[PDB]
DNA sequence: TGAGGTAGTAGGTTGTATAGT
DNA sequence: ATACAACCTACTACCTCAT
């Protein structure tokens, strides 16, 4: 009969430094961690995008109520919560019309079709964005139905509404809209007019399509989250975490474009304490391995990332960070990481740890309906533990895992360090999620955003981007 | 003197509106008297509202929701603070704190009908900030804001029902502990005996192509039906490689490391596996993946073994309790049981589209909880085993592989209360 | 919340070396 | 020619977002 070590849950800090464990709690009792002048919002939708798009900045003024407000807490009111107005009479908009809408999105490909209508919302988000003396401060994208429902690969337009011929005979339009935007610097916020007007768009029966009474301010909570931290501060910080750790997020995607099946983009994102991170955009390379079906890299570019970091981390904080904790979801070749020791100063601690789930031990608590809360941990070693980042939480009376919980396998596959901390750091990461908020995700942040990332690297491959903050990324 | 902001409230409609207005006000730097801080156990608990309105009660608030107007409660509780309207002879007293979006004139109760509105409709901080605006232009008594008051209530008071606790507690992985295994692993230098065309699945014991030699827990006498002129191969050419030391790391061929070897014993297990279920009397769903195991319907009396229920009924389609087999060998060799939900619109005939079991598979797992899903698996392996410990997987005639039927228990000191 | 998309993982299907003409 | 290497492809359990 093993033994189950805990973990105290991390504390996220709110305004006046009074930390607790909820976000929506802790923004709702003292508000976000540096209160922000108002939030300018720019509009990028359909003269109806702006109504839908004034029906929740309105709505989301009065408290909105979930269906119950334990396992999901309530949202004050925008103004309540962050302490500062998302006005709905203060928008900048620039219009986009069915016109624009029916001549760029009837193309036979998908891809001409996506690829334009993306580069429509561009102009007029950068024509908005650079022209402009006026200042937004998050531009919104609010996506009519139309442009979600064919603007990625997979969905086909019916031959009966294209008006040109495929010329010949990547391809998710939000992604790429964030990708192209990327080289100039510019908060995107995208929105479906399906969610924030859920009760407009009835089906045939006439009840709605999707139907959200039940989370209706659990929305508010994520979007004015992400809107917030967009519009510049963040919510809240990381209670205690000691000073001077560097979170690495490997991140790689396959390029399924190239002949040699081996291209994939690569990336590293820079967490520390905050969470609004910081995305190091390494190059194109040979990662991807057909045997091992794993991603590495080779020590040059690998060098080159680490340096990247850690100089941006001295520029930042004046110093080189005393731990380096590198996350990936694969183990490390011996080569690789000898390439992160030389860039690494002396004493510096750089450890790799591989965050997989894998489907091992799921642990089903004995007597009763709700399993094991989020926090308990197996150690299987001093080196590999299982940590449940899932599972029944009390200040929410709810299992985060609807179902029954998987924990997470975290090896120190390479360096050394103490396992328990290990465990709370990562614990301690889940919490750091701005955009989605909740109470902790089920992965740590440094790998939670990866595979939508991931898209975001190959979707643009010319760029060379500086290394970037999340809202640019998100 | 008197000092406190006494909220008068409907619970549960308004809680959460008055959590958040006292809590916001505490933090303010206001004391708040509210039901919501204390866990009254008095005859006086309403002499303790009494007494509060009655002395030391700067301000009343009430909640003016259709609930707070109608409720008994609340009536008596505003019943105070008219009765002392008038000894401290100020016009603002009492505030109705008009959070409803929907109060009608004849709901709201005559006294605070007359009274101004604190608007809590058009937004919770609009107001927050004309309560406290108002709070300026009568001089209602403050403190230099600690919202460190504010949220040792949250933390303590609201949170007090539902923390972590200092509780002991058990739970039941789905690894399952491999017992006995084979005294050694043997490598057959089969050789002209060996053809690789063939295909040894239907060879009704675990095999495998590793290099020219051939692997198995299977001593070489053991496939004779459908491997003839096999007679021919000496006992002693095999390797016969210790498995004791296999785990361990002991064994390091450079021809062939044990990372190979630690590979090798699981297809092998896996498949004792999906031999074993060919006899052990559950019908097989097929994944891609690997096979999973719902026993049909009828097989246990009335659908239920050992007081569960693996099978049921869910709309038109029964329901069966599947399982599956990954053997892990790290840290400790066990066999992991991955639980399934396979789906029949009849007792044995299966499902054709997947579109069909996937939106099944999500519609009956609502109804499962920990407790649930636990049970079905437990038994379902309690089901197969047989006998009083382990199952039973035949890798050949003299050896098996022996499975726990009950599954590593971890225990935890810390625990929930559960609601 | 939930209709979605993603991430494991096996393999059988498939694309490359060997080997002999 | 095949005797094999290394892919690629369903299928499913989870987990996320044009949230
Ligand atoms: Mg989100």
């Known amino acids: 009969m093993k033994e189950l070590i805990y973990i105290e849950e991390p504390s996220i800090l709110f305004a006046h430094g009074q930390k607790c464990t909820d976000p929506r709690d802790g923004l709702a009792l003292f508000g976000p961690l540096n209160q922000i002048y108002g939030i300018k919002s720019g509009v990028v939708g359909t003269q109806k995008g702006l109504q839908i798009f004034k029906s929740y900045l309105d709505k989301i003024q009065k408290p909105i109520y979930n269906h119950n407000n334990i396992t999901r807490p309530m949202f004050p009111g925008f103004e309540a919560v962050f302490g500062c107005k998302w006005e709905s009479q203060n928008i900048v908009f620039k219009e986009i019309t069915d016109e624009e809408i029916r001549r760029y999105l009837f193309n036979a490909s998908t891809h001409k079709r996506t690829y334009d209508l993306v580069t429509l919302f561009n102009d007029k988000i950068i024509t908005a964005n650079k022209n402009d003396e006026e200042r937004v401060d998050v531009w919104f994208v609010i996506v009519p139905e139309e442009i979600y429902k064919y603007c990625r690969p997979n969905s086909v337009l019916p031959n009966e509404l294209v008006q040109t011929k495929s010329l010949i005979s990547d391809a998710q339009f939000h992604d790429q809209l964030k990708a192209r935007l990327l080289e100039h610097t510019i908060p995107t916020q995208i929105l479906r007019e399906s969610t924030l007007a859920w009760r407009d768009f009835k089906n045939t029966f006439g009840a709605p399509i999707r139907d959200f009474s039940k989370i209706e301010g659990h929305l508010a909570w994520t979007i004015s989250t992400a809107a917030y931290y967009k519009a510049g501060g963040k919510p809240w910080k990381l209670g205690d975490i000691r000073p001077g750790v560097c979170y690495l997020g490997l991140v790689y995607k396959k390029i399924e474009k190239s002949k040699n099946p081996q291209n994939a983009c690569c990336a590293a994102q820079m967490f520390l304490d905050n969470g609004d991170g910081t995305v190091f955009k390494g190059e194109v390379g040979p990662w991807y391995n057909p045997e091992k079906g794993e991603y590495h890299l080779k020590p040059k570019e690998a060098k080159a990332l680490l340096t990247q970091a850690l100089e941006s981390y001295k520029e930042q904080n004046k110093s080189y960070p005393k731990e380096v904790f590198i996350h990936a979801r694969t183990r490390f070749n011996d080569e690789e990481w000898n390439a992160f020791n030389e860039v690494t100063p002396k004493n510096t601690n750089l450890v790799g740890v591989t965050i997989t789930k894998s489907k091992p031990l799921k642990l089903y608590k004995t007597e009763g309906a709700f399993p094991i809360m989020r926090g308990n941990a197996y150690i299987v070693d001093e080196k590999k533990a299982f940590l449940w980042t899932l599972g029944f939480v009390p200040k929410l009376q709810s299992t985060l895992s609807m179902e029954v919980p998987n924990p997470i396998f975290i090896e120190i596959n390479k360096g050394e360090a103490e396992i328990q901390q290990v465990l709370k750091d990562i614990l301690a990461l889940t919490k750091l999620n701005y955009n989605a908020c909740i109470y902790a995700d089920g992965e740590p942040v440094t790998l939670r955003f990866a595979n939508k990332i991931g898209e975001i690297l190959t979707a643009s491959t010319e760029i060379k981007t500086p290394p970037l903050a999340f809202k640019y990324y998100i | ?419």
């Not at chain 2, 009660?57 to 609340?74: D, P, Q």
């Not at chain 2, 101004?116 to 009568?138: P, V």
């Not at chain 2, 053997?327 to 049981?337: D, E, F, I, N, T």
């Open chain 2, 1 to 419: 003197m008197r000092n406190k902001i006494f909220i008068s409230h409907a619970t549960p409609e308004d809680d959460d509106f008055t959590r958040w207005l006292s809590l916001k006000l505490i933090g303010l730097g206001y004391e708040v008297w509210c039901d919501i801080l204390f866990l009254d156990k008095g005859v006086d608990f309403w002499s303790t509202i009494e007494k509060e309105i009655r002395e030391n009660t700067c301000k009343f608030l009430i909640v003016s929701s259709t609930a707070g107007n109608k409720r008994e409660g609340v009536l008596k509780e505003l019943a105070v603070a008219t009765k002392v309207k008038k000894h401290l002879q100020d016009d603002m007293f009492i505030i109705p704190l008009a959070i409803d979006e929907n109060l009608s004139y004849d709901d709201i109760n005559i006294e605070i009908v007359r009274l101004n509105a604190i608007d809590f409709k058009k937004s919770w901080a609009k107001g927050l900030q004309d309560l406290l605006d108002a709070f300026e232009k009568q001089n209602v008594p403050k403190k230099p804001p600690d919202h460190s008051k504010s949220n040792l209530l949250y933390q303590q008071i609201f949170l007090h029902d539902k923390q972590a606790i200092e509780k002991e507690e058990t739970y039941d992985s789905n690894w399952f502990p491999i017992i006995s295994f084979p005294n050694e692993l043997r490598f057959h230098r089969y050789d002209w005996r060996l053809p690789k065309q063939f295909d040894v699945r239907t060879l009704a014991f675990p095999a495998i192509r590793y290099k020219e030699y051939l692997c198995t827990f299977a001593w070489e006498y053991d496939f004779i039906h459908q491997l003839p002129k096999t007679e021919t191969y000496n006992g002693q050419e095999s390797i016969r490689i210790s498995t004791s030391d296999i785990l361990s790391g002991r064994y390091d061929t450079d021809f062939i490391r044990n990372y190979e070897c630690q590979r090798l014993i699981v297809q092998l297990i896996n498949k004792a596996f999906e031999l074993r279920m060919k006899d052990k009397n559950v019908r097989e769903y097929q994944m891609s993946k690997t096979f999973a195991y719902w026993i049909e319907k009828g097989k246990l009396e009335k659908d239920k073994f050992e007081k569960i229920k693996l099978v049921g009924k869910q709309k038109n389609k029964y329901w069966h309790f599947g399982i599956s087999a990954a053997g892990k060998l790290y840290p400790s060799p066990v066999l992991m049981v991955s639980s399934h939900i396979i789906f029949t619109m009849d007792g044995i005939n299966l499902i054709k589209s997947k579109s069909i079991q996937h939106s099944s598979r999500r519609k009956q797992g609502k109804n499962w909880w920990n407790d649930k899903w636990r049970e079905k698996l437990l038994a379902f392996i309690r089901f197969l085993s047989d006998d009083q410990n382990a199952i039973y997987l035949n890798v050949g005639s003299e050896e098996k592989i022996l499975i726990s039927n009950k599954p590593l228990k971890f225990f935890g000191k810390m625990s929930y209360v559960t609601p």
